[PDB]
Amino acid sequence: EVQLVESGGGSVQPGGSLKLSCKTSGFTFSSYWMYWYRQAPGKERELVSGINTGGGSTYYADSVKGRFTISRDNAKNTLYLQMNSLKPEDTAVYYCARRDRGGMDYWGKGTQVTVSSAAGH
Ligand code: NA
């Protein structure tokens, strides 16, 4: 079965950094564009970033430009999101997704990121 599994979430200080991983199995990852989405409190789901097969970013949301970097490792079949200069409003469940025209969408279960002044340093 197709598997997408996010990890790397947790609590982090405002201004801090986190790197999320989306480890995949059960399909030819290197053939697909891949995406990060997020679901924040009281808001609609938001597309964060997309990446093409060869590992070039296709898109960043205005809200994350200059702070986040999408990347992939086709040898490990893993997608990443490096997040920097985190803000309270980046608190959300983050999801990786495989989506393509006339194909079936697949989503991970998501990972919680919490940007909090009470986070460990
Ligand atoms: Na896709």
Residue numbers in the entry: 1 to 121
Give excerpts from the publication.
Single domain antibodies (sdAbs) can be generated from variable regions of heavy‐chain antibodies, which lack light chain and CH1 region. To obtain sdAbs against Nlgn2, we prepared the extracellular domain of Nlgn2 as a recombinant protein and immunized an alpaca with it. We employed site‐directed mutagenesis and introduced all four VHH‐like mutations (V37Y, G44E, L45R, W47L) into the hallmark residues in FR2 of both sdAb A and B (denoted as sdAb FR2 YERL mutants) and prepared the FR2 YERL mutants as recombinant proteins.
To further enhance the solubility of sdAb A, we explored the effects of additional mutations to reduce surface hydrophobicity. sdAb A possesses leucine at position 11, whereas the corresponding residue in camelid VHH is highly conserved as serine. Taken together with a previous study suggesting that mutation of leucine to serine would improve the solubility of VHH (Muyldermans et al., 1994), we introduced the L11S mutation in the sdAb A FR2 YERL mutant (denoted as sdAb A YERLS, the terminal S corresponds to L11S) to investigate the effects of this mutation on solubility. We expressed and purified sdAb A YERLS by IMAC, conducted SEC, and confirmed that sdAb A YERLS was eluted in a monomeric state. To confirm that the mutations did not alter the overall structure of the sdABs, we conducted X‐ray crystallographic analysis for both sdAb A YERLS and sdAb B YERLA. When FR structures were superposed, the root‐mean‐squared deviation (C α‐RMSD) values between the crystal structure of mutants and predicted WT structures were 0.58 Å and 0.40 Å for sdAb A and B, respectively. SPR analysis confirmed that the mutants sdAb A YERLS and sdAb B YERLA maintained their binding activity, although the affinity for Nlgn2 was low for both engineered sdAbs.
